[PDB]
């Protein structure tokens, strides 16, 4: 029974590969030569946020596009007024091994998580005036790797226990477990409509999940190593992933197959963070070579080098209005480029 | 030209920076040890005795020097980012049950994986051959030859077995131009493990200073 079970498993594998290939008449590479190239894009350090004592691992831009939250090994969450490089809050984390940080779309909450396997929600707007812990969501048997807010009450967390989950902050209990990945989940990127989310989980695979139901609609193959970063296209039906094989790859949900490969022979180090531009023409990506490379999402050519970091660019985010890009690295500094 | 409220916000940021600078001295002076051990390595007893005088943390003071021993026994992962959280760790305290001869090979494999991870290149390894009296009473009875044919001395002499174990552990270390590897044949009731750990951490900091001095 198990032999024939794997038999139709492989049969469905060939069926889906054949469907994708038959739907693949031409590549985005061939259809893009006609349109004007992005040219040369040059960015400079507008502001250099300093004050962190250790390596940054995650940064998230607020919806107002002026406040950003940063996490580092000193166990401190620092919120920056990027316009005036002023620290707003300094939240002393319970666990110093923080590996992800989030900003609520409303702006009233920030969530941090790490090796403690707990995603902790921090309330920023309280009568006492000091940021307090609102909820310690527990239930994951793996290290927290990425957490993103949907509303002020629902948050999706991905961990190393091969299972992403949607929580309920008011109850504090898990609601739906997005199981199906066979490896440690590394990153998540909620869709702009907040009804779907993708995640790469070290199996070179990214699964698109339906938040309302809880089943992964479609699994994306490709890649050769652990997908360390995943971002969602602004339009809502495409996503780009970064891995440890130094290749950024763009998938589409409707075509459920690879579209382009943003790989260059010069770089050999993996990608730690990926985020698109406001219209998605640019595919900014932070690598371990101590700098970020800007890619044209339609032609896959190096549009520019976002150099200026003394260590590996661990995190990289783009504002909602797209008027700035924030890169965090292991040199305990954040630089905002424009 | 800044407004009154913008000036006050800058003042609040200055106070936050002052607090961060106050914590900076402790952060930079603190040494962290990642304690990696097996289930039978007697990690729990050594940990309990050392403090007296998810993942866990044990902060303690040795010779007015900040210390933090990180135990990841419950949650251990082979992924790159999980190991990358401990690249800034000063030294790795590896605990091995020498007395448990039958389990030496798996401990050797784990030691090889830890020391050849390429994320622990800049950290030192403080090996701790623990259960030394158990080791001696087993050595006077049983021979390391049955489980390890490469041993060359008399399997009933303690020094021969200890040297063979140290040699076999050191051979697993692929690169010898990196941070030093330290070995100690101390039991859990030595009550001097803090002194040895401090000595080896000071030696590692000495090595870092020598690297910074362009003396090589």
């Amino acid at each position: 029974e198990l032999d024939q079970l794997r038999q139709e498993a492989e049969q469905l594998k060939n069926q889906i590969r054949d469907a994708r290939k038959a739907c693949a008449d031409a590549t985005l590479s061939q259809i893009t030569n006609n349109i004007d190239p992005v040219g040369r894009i040059q960015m400079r350090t507008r502001r250099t946020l300093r004050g962190h004592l250790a390596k940054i691992y995650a940064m998230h831009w607020g919806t107002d596009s002026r406040l950003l939250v940063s996490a580092s090994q000193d166990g401190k969450l620092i919120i920056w007024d990027s316009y005036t490089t002023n620290k707003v809050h300094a939240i002393p984390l319970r666990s110093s091994w923080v590996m992800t940080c989030a900003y609520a779309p409303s702006g009233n909450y920030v969530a941090c998580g790490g090796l403690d396997n707990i995603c902790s929600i921090y309330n920023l707007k309280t009568r006492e005036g000091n940021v307090r812990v609102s909820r310690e969501l527990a239930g994951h048997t793996g290290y927290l790797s990425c957490c993103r807010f949907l509303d002020d009450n629902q948050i999706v967390t991905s961990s190393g226990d091969t299972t992403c989950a949607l929580w309920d902050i008011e109850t504090g209990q898990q609601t739906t477990t997005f199981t199906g990945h066979t490896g440690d989940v590394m990153s998540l990127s909620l869709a702009p409509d907040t009804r779907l989310f993708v995640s790469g989980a070290c199996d070179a695979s990214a699964k698109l999940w339906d938040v309302r139901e809880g089943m992964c609609r479609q699994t994306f193959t490709g890649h050769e190593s652990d997908i360390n970063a995943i971002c969602f296209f602004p339009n809502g039906n495409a996503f780009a992933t970064g891995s440890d094989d130094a290749t950024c790859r763009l998938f589409d949900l409707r075509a459920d197959q690879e579209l382009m490969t943003y790989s260059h022979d010069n770089i050999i180090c993996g990608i730690t963070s990926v985020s698109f531009s406001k219209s998605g023409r640019l595919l900014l990506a932070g690598y371990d070579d101590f700098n970020c490379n800007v890619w044209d999402a339609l032609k896959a050519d190096r549009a520019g080098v976002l150099a200026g970091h003394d260590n590996r660019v661990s995190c990289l985010g783009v504002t909602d209005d797209g008027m700035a890009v924030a890169t965090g690295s292991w040199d305990s500094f954040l630089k905002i480029w424009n | 030209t800044l407004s009154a409220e913008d000036k006050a916000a800058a003042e609040r940021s200055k106070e936050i920076d002052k607090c961060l600078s106050r914590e900076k001295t402790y952060v930079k002076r603190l040494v962290k040890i990642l304690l990696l051990g097996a289930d039978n390595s007697g990690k729990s007893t050594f940990l309990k005795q050392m403090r007296i005088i998810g993942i866990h943390e044990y902060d303690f003071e040795i010779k007015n020097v900040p210390f933090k021993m990180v135990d990841v026994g419950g949650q251990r992962s082979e992924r790159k980012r999980w190991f990358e959280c401990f690249d800034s760790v000063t030294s790795i305290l590896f605990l091995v049950d020498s007395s448990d001869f039958n389990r030496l090979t798996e401990s050797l494999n784990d030691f090889e994986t830890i020391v050849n991870n390429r994320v622990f290149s800049n950290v030192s390894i403080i090996l701790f051959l623990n259960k030394t009296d158990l080791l001696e009473e087993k050595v006077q009875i049983v021979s390391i030859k049955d489980y390890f044919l490469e041993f060359e001395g008399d399997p009933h002499c303690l020094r021969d077995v200890q040297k063979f174990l140290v040699e076999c552990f050191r051979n697993k270390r692929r690169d010898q131009q990196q941070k030093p590897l330290y070995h100690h044949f101390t039991t859990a009731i030595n009550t001097e493990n803090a002194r040895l750990i401090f000595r080896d951490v000071k030696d590692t900091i000495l090595h870092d200073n020598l690297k910074q001095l362009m003396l090589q």
Partner: single-chain antibody, 235 residues
């Protein structure tokens, strides 16, 4: 909850000295800056002093510069005001005001019920409102207006105008901060807008908690001059 209780009230003779102590309980006193606003027996609010978080910057009003000293004790969670050589112009009830300052904060958030001190016997931004005892029916829509001598719109893009509600016999509470933002806990019926100088506050509905005296504060200049009293009254 958040409480701000002060102490010290007596009929001191002119030229004497006294100390106003304000005790804080229920919030991080160190992070919050503290002000001191006083009101003559029947007059409007007037700013006196200010101490920042950590006792960094200490400002004073020109009428009380030198005579008055404000010191805060963070571990004691207490705010102190050393006043000497009081005149008859100091006959007032002194309000303690907390104000935390960061991006998006709500300065002048909570006020404390003051203690009355009854003394025996320019560059300041002039904010004036030309209203007094507006006849108002319950449920109607009204628009309280305030004016500023110098425009309060800074290059940062936010006007530093504040609206305060002082209910009869009750300490003032913050309604609008920065001309537009609703304060926490206040109904959406309150709404405010304005321009570089012209300011206005409109209230959609008129229930029992709205009858009182309204105030407008400038926060561009540290003298922190107030306006007159509108004195909303039921028709």
């Amino acid at each position: 909850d958040v409480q701000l209780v002060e102490s010290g009230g007596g009929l001191v003779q002119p030229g004497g000295s006294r100390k106003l102590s304000c005790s804080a309980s229920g919030f991080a006193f160190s992070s919050f800056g503290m002000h001191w606003v006083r009101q003559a027996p029947e007059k409007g609010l007037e700013w006196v002093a200010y101490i920042s978080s950590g006792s960094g910057t200490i400002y004073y009003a020109d009428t009380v510069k030198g005579r008055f000293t404000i010191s805060r004790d963070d571990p004691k969670n207490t705010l102190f005001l050393q006043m000497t050589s009081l005149r008859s112009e100091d006959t007032a009830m002194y309000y303690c005001v907390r104000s935390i300052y960061y991006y998006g904060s709500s300065p002048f958030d909570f006020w404390g019920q003051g203690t009355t001190l009854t003394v025996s016997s320019s560059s300041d931004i002039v904010m004036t409102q030309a209203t007094s005892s507006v006849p108002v029916t319950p449920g109607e829509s009204v628009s309280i207006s305030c004016r500023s001598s110098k425009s309060l719109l800074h290059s940062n893009g936010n006007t530093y105008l504040y609206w305060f509600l002082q209910r009869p016999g009750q300490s003032p509470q913050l309604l609008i901060y920065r001309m537009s933002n609703l304060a926490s806990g206040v109904p959406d019926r309150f709404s405010g807008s304005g321009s570089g100088t012209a300011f206005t506050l409109t209230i959609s509905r008129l229930e029992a908690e709205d009858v009182g005296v309204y105030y407008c504060m400038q926060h561009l200049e540290y003298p922190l001059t107030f306006g007159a009293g509108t004195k909303l009254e039921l028709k």
